[PDB]
């Protein structure tokens, strides 16, 4: 009846005021959440953002991460104080049909992330081991056994394995930056919140600073990682009777989550400066993983003789594909955990990790093998580009399931009927939290029309455009109705 019954309140190791060892104990949840924010689904968008705007968008990244650190912490709080995840709170404060709508929506979000990671991992196999593109996908389907071995290890080593992947993809991209020797003064100048990133005048590569900045801000959080954080935050036993120990617990999970999401921010920065210093100006013409592979393997694309010799040897591209692999291993863990959370929390369905990863992976790979089937039917022409367009088109479900995950979180944590007058949010995080939630909801509701119109490709059929407008209006209006309904129920609880 409690979230993550297998590993809920497992190891509690606060030992008086020995704070840093205590920090070493529970440092796992923050990493499990942060590794999701390093998935390849936006890697190109960073590199592109670096080529179109050298170091300019870095500050935006920071801001985004900060916002991601805020809401995530809130989620952790809901897990630590209430001893129940976000899905159990929402489902407990609304009917079953709303919990079912939220269930299918979040399932579609984690399904979208799973699509990004199966595409990135399959391509990673196509680049490293030269496995055929169609075989690499059905090889990625075999991650259920890696989940079976993953199940017997334990969170003290699983949550450290996630750290291992994090520093793998962090040191892979940091190594290519160390060889690049970039002008770190311009990097520092770019990290400052300047007003050149909010303008619309450069328009390099069909992208203005305000478009890229609002895109980075719009994709701030992932809805599934909120339920994930609220669930894994409970894995540390708390008496819930001593205010100093639960306040200490909040400091604990906060410093952990910031320590890891800061690493994710560092990875995004390494991707932007990867697009600025490593690649030449405008050298990246194919945002696909294969385009970045050949671009990292062509000496004329880099801006340094050392990177030209190393690129000719073929080490940059292989490290890139290794980073694709280490990033593609995330949904096997966080996808199954979060899927269990929303499943047994929203619809009260107890399913094993076997059929979970089976169903999610199959539903994820169906459109992938359809895309590879059509493109390979065209002669393997534009197959990687179409895989990239599938990966980017999949991210609409996140915008569909974002407000129904950030609004109920902020409401339930701001109310005293769930947190109490002692552990509710400060008047500071009320203003910042509501501002962030409003901005993200508006920006994603704007993104719905752009992505739905993007489903029809870069060929604008005049009759299909109006249909995209009708479908977009219907979707955003339906999300408005669901949003005001959830607002009404939660505000009826408070």
Author numbering: 13 to 506
From the reporting publication:
conserved and function as secondary active transporters. transport proteins that include the amino acid transporter LeuT18. μM range and that metal ion transport is coupled to the cotransport of protons. of the prokaryotic SLC11 transporter EcoDMT.
mutants of Glu129 and reduced to half in H236A. different role in proton-coupled metal ion transport. does not function as primary H+-acceptor. the pKa of Glu129 would have to be shifted upwards. in vicinity to the metal ion coordinating Asp51.
